[PDB]
Amino acid sequence: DGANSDAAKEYLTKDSFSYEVYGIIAMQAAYRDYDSGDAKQDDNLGGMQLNNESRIGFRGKKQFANFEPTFIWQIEGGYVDPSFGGEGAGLGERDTFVGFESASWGQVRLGRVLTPMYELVDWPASNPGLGDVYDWGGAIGGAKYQDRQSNTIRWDSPMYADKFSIDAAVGAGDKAGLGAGDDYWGGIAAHYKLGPLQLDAAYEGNRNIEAEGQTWENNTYLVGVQGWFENGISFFAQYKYMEADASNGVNEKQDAMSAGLMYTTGDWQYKLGYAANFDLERDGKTLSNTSDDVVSAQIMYFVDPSAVLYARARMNDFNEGLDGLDDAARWTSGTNGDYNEYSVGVEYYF
Amino acid sequence: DGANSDAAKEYLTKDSFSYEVYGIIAMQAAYRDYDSGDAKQDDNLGGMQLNNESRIGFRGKKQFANFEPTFIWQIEGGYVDPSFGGEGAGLGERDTFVGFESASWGQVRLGRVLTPMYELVDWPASNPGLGDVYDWGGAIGGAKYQDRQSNTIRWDSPMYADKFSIDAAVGAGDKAGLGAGDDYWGGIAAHYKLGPLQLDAAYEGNRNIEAEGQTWENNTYLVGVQGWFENGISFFAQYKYMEADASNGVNEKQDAMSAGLMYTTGDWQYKLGYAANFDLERDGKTLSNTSDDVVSAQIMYFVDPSAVLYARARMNDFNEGLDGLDDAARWTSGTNGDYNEYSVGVEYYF
Amino acid sequence: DGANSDAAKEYLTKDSFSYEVYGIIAMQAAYRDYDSGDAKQDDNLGGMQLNNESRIGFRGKKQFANFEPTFIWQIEGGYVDPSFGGEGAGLGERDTFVGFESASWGQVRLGRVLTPMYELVDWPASNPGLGDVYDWGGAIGGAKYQDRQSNTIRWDSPMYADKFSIDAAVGAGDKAGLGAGDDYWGGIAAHYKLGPLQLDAAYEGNRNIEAEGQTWENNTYLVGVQGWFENGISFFAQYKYMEADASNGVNEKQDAMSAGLMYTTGDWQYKLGYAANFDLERDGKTLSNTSDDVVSAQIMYFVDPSAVLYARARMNDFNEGLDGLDDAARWTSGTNGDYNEYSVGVEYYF
Ligand SMILES: CN[C@@H]1[C@@H](O)[C@@H](O[C@@H]2[C@@H](O)[C@H](O[C@H]3O[C@H](CN)CC[C@H]3N)[C@@H](N)C[C@H]2N)OC[C@]1(C)O
Ligand SMILES: CCCCCCCCOCCOCCOCCOCCO
Ligand SMILES: CCCCCCCCOCCOCCOCCOCCO
Ligand code: NA
Ligand code: NA
Ligand code: NA
Ligand code: NA
Ligand code: NA
Ligand code: NA
Ligand code: NA
Ligand code: NA
């Protein structure tokens, strides 16, 4: 069984107690109110649900006797009981990898991690609740980018000159990872600290992506600013340019932004979010009402050095529909309709 | 990813070493002898199997700095290799929840737990091996009650006056948990200790259940006694009334009982149990041969304060079949036929 | 739920801290180049992939107060993110069992383990990368033997006279474990160490195996030698004879060999491996082009007492096709075509 059987137990010396067990406990009671234009469908999707995103993980580091880079590894399970889905999570569904890190050249990781692009798209630009629009939202064909991805080599640089830092990565695609395609992708991201600000830029290219009966080339570019100030204010703003190119000559473009404001004061943190996709342009013809936007408010309370309570409201107004290149409806995050969500939740880290 | 991604790891202080790892090791070597009236089907279902119900779990408590109630959480994986099923269980398949508790008002839990009704159906009734008949057995339409269920808020009262105790909960149904329905349920249970006896009462109502082309209403009532005596005798008895009501006017009723006698002597414990479903009445007319009954015997031996060995035999006589309100056979615990079972097993708690 | 509900938590004394957490970290970057005579399939199946075979497990032992044999238990999860498959593994997918052990007669284990034959087929044969041909390779009908299998009772003898050793087991088949068949199997294996050499023999018989419209009986025999010398040289050689017999009278026979050479020198270990399946004989007529071959080379580096690095190249030349007794293509490990593979990897034991 496996590349080297269980011969690891028979020949190597067990490095006893060289692990940390960790977990994030996270529950969110969330009520959803849909306006899909169908009353029956509105009642199924909408309602109260308990979105339990708790998870257990294991991680550790080892200094190999005869290797300069330090070995690192991680196995993090998925959400134990998310909303809209069944119970029980596997080990290895979130960030799971081995890797090396030397003070001389930064960090390398092989396995299942976030692409340099998505890492910025996810945080800060997706919080709180902007993900339906800015994360996996959109109308562009092909693969706008990957999120958390397996079969990935990712290199994380150290803080160069105490201001600059780099992340770059390449990997196989979703279909390639199952032996049923040859899609691949690559991407890189940059960060520069200019005082209390931080500037960000990132790129990602996806290739040989089969969808809607075509092969796709996807290119996505991103710029953003982030600020933290001592009076308590933090902000973030981001602009995102999405370009898709199909094998039948069809070109596609769509852009999007995300911005968030927050005031931390003592034991409280107030926060407003807004993100939006602009109209999608296919073959140089703007498609009417292909945009999405979402507004969001949240009050958080630092109940413990290790935990927080929070309430949150948000309203998603999605596009009115899109047609695919195969002459059938193309799924978007708004296929299920506009909806509002009100929720309270807890998060705790041990 | 998620309501707050990995922002808990980057910003919150890791409460290091504040978790418990626990497990129940449980193996059951079980031979089954089926009498379904088909020699082939008898041979597939019947035979020797290893029912491995072992499980690993994680749990903990934390006193939040600025909150009086103590935080609680649990994540329990399911059976690692049960009979009739493939190997491997996810993390979070069993009781998995967050909650708070103060000794003045008991505990509240959010997540996936046992409903107050089913908990009594589970223990003391249903043991040993009475479950096929009393637990998920029956012929009534809709949902007589839920088992272990997600999207549940449940409050467990403290022991008032050291004699009275209460459990209550409400939650989402199976289809709602996937955004495909609007079913819900609620229930309550009461306990009173009168010396060596204990009285039990419980209710559960199920609403908006889609099945066999109808919407269903379910109502279930339960009463029971339990006795522990120093001489060594222990017993339990229970009566259960189930009322279902369909959207096309059809009414349905069925009742059941469960009783068990037990003799503990030193390191040994003998136990004989009986459970039965009585004929189902649809539209106030008894349906012939819709009953089920089971007899069961078991010898247990306390090999360690932390483990037990046990032998057990049981014979199940199931109902012979009934059609649902859609004119198709309604699945029951006897769809696979009658069967007797002989088994040995171990249980261990770390 | 289950054979005894959650009554183990309610009555038994938690044997706190009698659990060990263990894991094997294993990542392999593997490039594949397929030449199946189909270009689209060559590129889907072929390419670079990251085969993460890491795994977490738990094991422990307990001395029961009122039992002389020591109780042992194990729950080992599966590969967290293997190549050609999705992410996330269950708890209990690798070796998972309960058992007892006394120094007088060895150990007995109930659950999920390797059959005495496969353990030898697995290690030392099949390494490095000979498994496609020697492990699950072959063209014989029915089931030559089981891999890691559930519903198994297995006995491992002590080291008799410091030279002799025996392993034997019996269990249920793949279909029987799901209530859909009555297949079973049994097998035994013996080892004798003569100085720097070691002699190996094993047998396994499988019965009531349903496939290709017939029921099958399988008989598989194996002999092998292993050598370790102070010079640094080690080798292994194995011959395998497989006999299958169908319910329509059709007989089939096929044999195979596996061989490996290794030179350990300081912190490096070189290794050449070869394994092959010979032409398949059905009804005493050798079938043309049913043989399989694989050559493999490997460089290993003991990077730490607890880990190794390795590079590996290997060439797989498979059979040209075979028809089953149902007059349809019979799946073999070469159905997807020939492929060569170049790979690097790390393995770590904590
Ligand atoms: C990251 N969260 C994901 C989110 O990315 C998204 O994923 C969609 C997925 O739902 C779509 O699939 C959905 O719509 C299909 C329309 N023909 C039918 C099947 C349905 N599950 C996929 N076609 C594309 C993914 N990006 O919706 C599911 C989710 C779990 O919330
Ligand atoms: C630093 C602050 C920057 C704020 C930038 C805000 C950009 C706002 O532009 C939004 C344009 O998109 C409008 C979306 O229209 C709604 C679409 O929904 C209806 C279906 O078409
Ligand atoms: C314990 C000693 C180990 C010996 C292993 C020897 C490995 C090399 O032996 C190769 C023998 O190959 C035989 C080829 O058989 C031809 C096919 O005949 C079978 C007809 O069904
Ligand atoms: Na709903
Ligand atoms: Na990295
Ligand atoms: Na992806
Ligand atoms: Na590939
Ligand atoms: Na069987
Ligand atoms: Na349920
Ligand atoms: Na993969
Ligand atoms: Na098997």
CB-CB: which of C1, C21, C182 is closest to B148? C1
* Alpha-carbon distances, residue C291 vs A140, C42, C322 (angstroms): 49, 21, 11
For residue B83, which residues of chain C lie inside 8 Å, CB to CB? 151, 177
Please give the full DSSP string across C18-56, using - where no structure is assigned: --EEEEEEEEEEEEEEEESS-HHHHHHH-EEEEEE--EE
Q: How far is CA C63 from the centre of its chain?
A: 31
According to DSSP, residue B138 is labeled -
Distance between Cα C126 and ligand 4 center (Å): 52
* Residue in the block written with tokens 């008894």: B286
C228-233: list long-range contacts, CB under 8 Å, 24+ apart.
Answer: C228/C196, C229/C196, C232/C263, C232/C264, C232/C265, C233/C261, C233/C262, C233/C263, C233/C264
Residue type, A294: V
A204: which 2 tokens?
A: 């990602």
φ and ψ of B284, to 5 deg:
70, 15
Of B262, B190, A178, the residue nearest C11 (C-alpha)? B262
**Residues paired with A192 in a beta bridge:** A164, A199
Inter-chain CB proximity A303 and B15 less than 8 Å: no
Please give the full DSSP string across B188-233, using - where no structure is assigned: EEEEEEETTEEEEEEEEEEEEEEETTEEEEEEEEEEEEEEE-TTSE
Residue type, C318: F
CB-based neighbours (< 5 A) of ligand 11, an ion: C 146-147, 149
Dist CA C114 CA C103 (whole Å): 22
CB-CB: which of A3, A18, A150 is closest to C350? A18
Contact C341, C46 (CB under 8 A): no
Q: What is the CA radius of gyration of chain C?
A: 22
CB-CB: which of C14, C58, C177 is closest to B56? C58
Of C54, C38, C55, the residue nearest C46 (C-alpha)? C38
B287: which 2 tokens?
A: 């349906």
φ and ψ of B227, to 5 deg:
-135, 135
Inter-chain CB proximity B49 and C93 less than 8 Å: no
Dist CA C292 CA C119 (whole Å): 21
3-state secondary structure chain A: CCCCCCHHHHHCCCCCCCCEEEEEEEEEEEEEEEECCCHHHHHHHCEEEEEECCEEEEEEEECCCCCCCEEEEEEECCCCECCCCCCCECECCCCEEEEEEECCCEEEEEEEEECHHHHHHHCCCCCCCCHHHHCCCCCCCCCCCCCEEEEEEEEECCCECCCEEEEEEEEECCCHHHCCCCCEEEEEEEEEEECCEEEEEEEEEEEEEEECCEEEEEEEEEEEEEEECCCCEEEEEEEEEEEEEECCCCEEEEEEEEEEEEEEECCEEEEEEEEEECCCEECCEECCCCCEEEEEEEEEEEEECCEEEEEEEEEEECCCCCECCCCCECCCCCCCCEEEEEEEEEEEEC
By C-alpha distance, the chain A residue nearest B56 is: A56
3-state SS class at B45: helix
Dist CA A29 CA A82 (whole Å): 11
**Residues paired with B323 in a beta bridge:** B329
According to DSSP, residue C324 is labeled -
3-state SS class at C97: strand
B44 touches chain C (CB under 8 A): yes
Chain breaks in chain B (C to N over 2.5 A) after: none
Dist CA B336 CA C320 (whole Å): 44
* Residue A320 beta carbon below 6 angstroms from any ligand 2 atom: yes
Please give the full DSSP string across C232-283, using - where no structure is assigned: SEEEEEEEEEEEEEETTS-EEEEEEEEEEEEEEETTEEEEEEEEEEPPPEET
Dist CA A64 CA A70 (whole Å): 7
Distance from CA of C194 to the nearest CA of B (A): 38
* Alpha-carbon distances, residue A66 vs A74, A97, C65, C309, C316 (angstroms): 22, 21, 46, 11, 33
A169 touches chain C (CB under 8 A): no
3-state SS class at C8: helix
Dist CA C22 CA C58 (whole Å): 6
* Residue A292 beta carbon below 6 angstroms from any ligand 2 atom: yes
φ and ψ of A205, to 5 deg:
-120, 130
* Residue in the block written with tokens 């738990």: C58
Dist CA C315 CA C32 (whole Å): 10
Scanning B201-220 for CB atoms below 8 A from C yields none
According to DSSP, residue B255 is labeled E
B168: which 2 tokens?
A: 């209550």
Contact C48, A153 (CB under 8 A): no
Neighbouring CB atoms inside 10 A of A289's CB total: 11
C53 touches chain A (CB under 8 A): yes
Query: Which of ligand 2's atoms lies nearest the C-alpha of A288?
Result: 21
Contact B315, B343 (CB under 8 A): no
Dist CA A347 CA B66 (whole Å): 15
Q: Parse chain A into domains and list their residue ranges.
A: 10-350
Residue type, A106: G
Residue type, C334: G
- Resolution for this model in angstroms, one decimal place? 2.9
Dist CA C218 CA C147 (whole Å): 14
Dist CA B85 CA B104 (whole Å): 43
Which residues are CB-neighbours of A345 under 8 A, at least 6 positions away?
A: A26, A27, A28, A29, A30, A51, A309, A310, A311, A312, B3
Residue type, A213: G
By C-alpha distance, the chain B residue nearest A51 is: B151
Contact B259, B146 (CB under 8 A): no
* Residue in the block written with tokens 């309501």: B3
* Alpha-carbon distances, residue B40 vs B27, B31, C218 (angstroms): 28, 17, 21
Contact A247, A217 (CB under 8 A): no
Contact C204, C140 (CB under 8 A): no
Q: Give the burial class of B313: count Cβ atoms within 10 A of its Cβ; 0-12 exposed, 13-18 middle, 19 or more buried.
A: middle
Please give the full DSSP string across C99-140, using - where no structure is assigned: EEEETTTEEEEEEEEE-HHHHHHHTTTTTTTTHHHHTS----
Q: Which ligand is nearest to the CA of A239?
A: 2
Mutate to test the pocket of ligand 1, among A136, A292, A318, A323 (most ligand atoms within 8 A of CB): A136
**Residues paired with C60 in a beta bridge:** C73
Dist CA C303 CA A100 (whole Å): 13
Of C220, C276, C213, C223, the residue nearest C252 (C-alpha)? C220
Q: What is the CA radius of gyration of chain A?
A: 22
Q: Is beta strand A268-277 parallel, antiparallel or unpaired with respect to A251-265? A: antiparallel
Of C228, C177, C231, C186, the residue nearest C204 (C-alpha)? C186
Which residues are CB-neighbours of A258 under 8 A, at least 6 positions away?
A: A125, A126, A130, A134, A224, A236, A237, A238, A240, A273, A274, A275, A276
What ranges make up the beta strands (E) of chain B? 20-35, 47-52, 55-62, 70-76, 96-102, 106-114, 148-156, 164-172, 184-194, 197-211, 214-228, 233-246, 251-265, 268-277, 281-282, 285-286, 292-304, 307-317, 338-349
Is the bond preceding A69 in cis, omega lying within 30 degrees of 0? no
Of C285, C207, C279, C278, the residue nearest C246 (C-alpha)? C207
Dist CA C292 CA A319 (whole Å): 56
* Residue A237 beta carbon below 6 angstroms from any ligand 2 atom: yes
C109: which 2 tokens?
A: 């284990």
Of C195, C189, C139, C187, the residue nearest C162 (C-alpha)? C195
Contact A227, A235 (CB under 8 A): yes
Neighbouring CB atoms inside 10 A of A200's CB total: 19
* Residue in the block written with tokens 């050689």: C237
The CA-based angle A349-B4-B6, given to 5 degrees, is: 55
Dist CA B140 CA B322 (whole Å): 10
Inter-chain CB proximity C110 and B308 less than 8 Å: no
Q: Which helix (H) or strand (E) holds C10?
A: helix C7-11
Q: Which chains touch A (3 or more CB pairs under 8 A)?
A: B, C
Exposure string over A10-19, b if 16+ CB within 10 A, otherwise e:
eebebbeeeb
For residue A114, which residues of chain C lie inside 8 Å, CB to CB? none
* Residue in the block written with tokens 């705790």: A348
Dist CA B135 CA B112 (whole Å): 18
Q: Whose CA is nearest to atom 13 of ligand 1?
A: A331
Which residues are CB-neighbours of A41 under 8 A, at least 6 positions away?
A: A34, A336, A337
Dist CA B144 CA B280 (whole Å): 13
A261 touches chain B (CB under 8 A): no
- What's chain A's length in residues? 350
Dist CA C9 CA B76 (whole Å): 13
Dist CA C282 CA A187 (whole Å): 54
Dist CA C93 CA B218 (whole Å): 38
Distance from CA of A286 to the nearest CA of B (A): 30
Of A42, A44, A47, A43, the residue nearest A32 (C-alpha)? A47
